[PDB]
Design an enzyme around this catalytic site. Structure first.
Site, mmCIF file in Angstrom:
data_model
loop_
_atom_site.group_PDB
_atom_site.id
_atom_site.type_symbol
_atom_site.label_atom_id
_atom_site.label_comp_id
_atom_site.label_asym_id
_atom_site.label_seq_id
_atom_site.Cartn_x
_atom_site.Cartn_y
_atom_site.Cartn_z
ATOM 1 N N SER A 108 36.359 61.173 -58.771
ATOM 2 C CA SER A 108 36.197 60.214 -59.848
ATOM 3 C C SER A 108 34.722 59.876 -59.964
ATOM 4 O O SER A 108 33.979 59.977 -58.989
ATOM 5 C CB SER A 108 37.000 58.945 -59.567
ATOM 6 N N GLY A 109 34.298 59.491 -61.160
ATOM 7 C CA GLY A 109 32.951 59.003 -61.361
ATOM 8 C C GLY A 109 33.037 57.500 -61.460
ATOM 9 O O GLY A 109 33.604 56.848 -60.588
ATOM 10 N N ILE B 226 39.403 66.573 -58.283
ATOM 11 C CA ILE B 226 38.498 66.633 -57.146
ATOM 12 C C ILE B 226 37.760 65.322 -56.904
ATOM 13 O O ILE B 226 37.090 65.166 -55.884
ATOM 14 C CB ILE B 226 37.450 67.750 -57.325
ATOM 15 N N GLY C 172 36.305 57.857 -65.270
ATOM 16 C CA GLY C 172 36.962 59.025 -65.810
ATOM 17 C C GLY C 172 37.415 59.781 -64.588
ATOM 18 O O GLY C 172 37.062 59.409 -63.467
ATOM 19 N N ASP C 173 38.185 60.839 -64.786
ATOM 20 C CA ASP C 173 38.591 61.637 -63.640
ATOM 21 C C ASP C 173 37.865 62.969 -63.655
ATOM 22 O O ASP C 173 37.478 63.453 -64.711
ATOM 23 C CB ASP C 173 40.113 61.794 -63.578
ATOM 24 N N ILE C 174 37.674 63.565 -62.487
ATOM 25 C CA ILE C 174 36.908 64.796 -62.414
ATOM 26 C C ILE C 174 37.788 65.890 -61.832
ATOM 27 O O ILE C 174 38.511 65.673 -60.867
ATOM 28 C CB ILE C 174 35.639 64.628 -61.546
ATOM 29 N N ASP D 183 23.088 52.398 -59.946
ATOM 30 C CA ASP D 183 24.134 52.635 -58.953
ATOM 31 C C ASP D 183 23.688 53.627 -57.889
ATOM 32 O O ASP D 183 24.359 54.630 -57.635
ATOM 33 C CB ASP D 183 25.432 53.116 -59.609
#
Length: 284
Positions: A15-16, A13, A19-21, A122
């Site tokens: 990315s941060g 769904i 990492g992948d989300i 950020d």
């Protein structure tokens, strides 16, 4: 397919920072969650930060932290759409009332993170998400992957002024100059985000390219940037740029600017943002 024997794994769904989300379901709840995965490193540090932030208003709750297979894994409550998503749904235009309502909460989130010894580093529309259900009017702040401690936990000794990162569009000028970030920089980035909400775009968009962005930011006077908008925004940005490296910002003053503006305009503090007023119908 289950992560941590409790959370069924789903589609990617997002990315941060690194990492992948993936979407997921706590089948033992039953709740929808977000799951961040990391190839075996930064996830564990971010998760320590999230755990330090727990309890604060608008901080997402960590359901589970651990590791499985070739991955480090963090499970978080899934929240609503980001402010960027909502901005796009509202035709990339927010009303003044909505901007001020957002500003109040956003300044509060940043203040809380500061109160817990960290700077986010950020600040951008994509790192603010709306809540769900009875918390649908609550603004959450996410992604502590670039976060960093600015003062000592016990003494509150501020870090020393130093040399030397997130998104260029909203980065503070000190960041472009390679200056170590502090509280003022989170607040400045917030200023750029708010003017972004007012304008639909910033004048340093669509111009290596970071050098052009930096020079455009430096060559754009605040009074030019904020032309045609309430003076509160220029006052805010000037205040943020005037803060010393280790100064404690007057968050209450900044909130009162926007609040007094809010009341002089006649708006009411209910929680009707622009996206609660979209018209729907047949395919046009």
């Amino acid at each position: 397919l289950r992560v941590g024997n409790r959370y069924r794994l789903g589609r990617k769904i997002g990315s941060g920072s690194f990492g992948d989300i993936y979407l997921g379901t706590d089948i033992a709840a039953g709740e929808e969650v977000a799951i961040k995965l990391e190839c075996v490193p930064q996830l564990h540090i971010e998760s320590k930060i999230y755990k330090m932030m727990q309890g604060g208003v608008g901080i997402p709750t960590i359901r589970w932290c651990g590791a499985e297979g070739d991955y480090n894994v963090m499970v978080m409550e899934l929240l609503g759409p980001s402010l960027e998503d909502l901005f796009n749904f509202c035709s990339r235009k927010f009303s003044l009332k909505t901007v001020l309502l957002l500003a109040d909460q956003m300044i509060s989130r940043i203040e809380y993170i500061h109160s817990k010894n960290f700077i986010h580093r950020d600040v951008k529309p994509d790192n603010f998400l709306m809540g769900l259900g009875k918390k649908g009017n609550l603004v959450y702040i996410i992604d502590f992957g670039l976060a960093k401690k600015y003062r000592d936990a016990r003494t509150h000794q501020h870090i020393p002024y130093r040399e030397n990162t997130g998104t260029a569009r909203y980065a503070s000028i000190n960041t472009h100059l390679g200056i170590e970030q502090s509280r003022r920089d989170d607040l400045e980035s917030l200023g750029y985000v708010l003017m972004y909400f007012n304008l639909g775009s910033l004048p340093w968009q669509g111009l290596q390219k970071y050098e052009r962005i930096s020079e455009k930011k430096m060559s754009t006077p605040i009074e030019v940037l904020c032309k045609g908008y309430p003076s509160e925004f220029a006052t805010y940005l000037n205040f943020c740029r005037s803060l010393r490296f280790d100064d404690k910002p007057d968050y209450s003053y900044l909130r009162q600017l926007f609040r007094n503006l809010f009341h002089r305009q006649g708006f009411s503090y209910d929680y009707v943002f622009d996206w609660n007023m979209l018209k729907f119908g047949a395919s046009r």
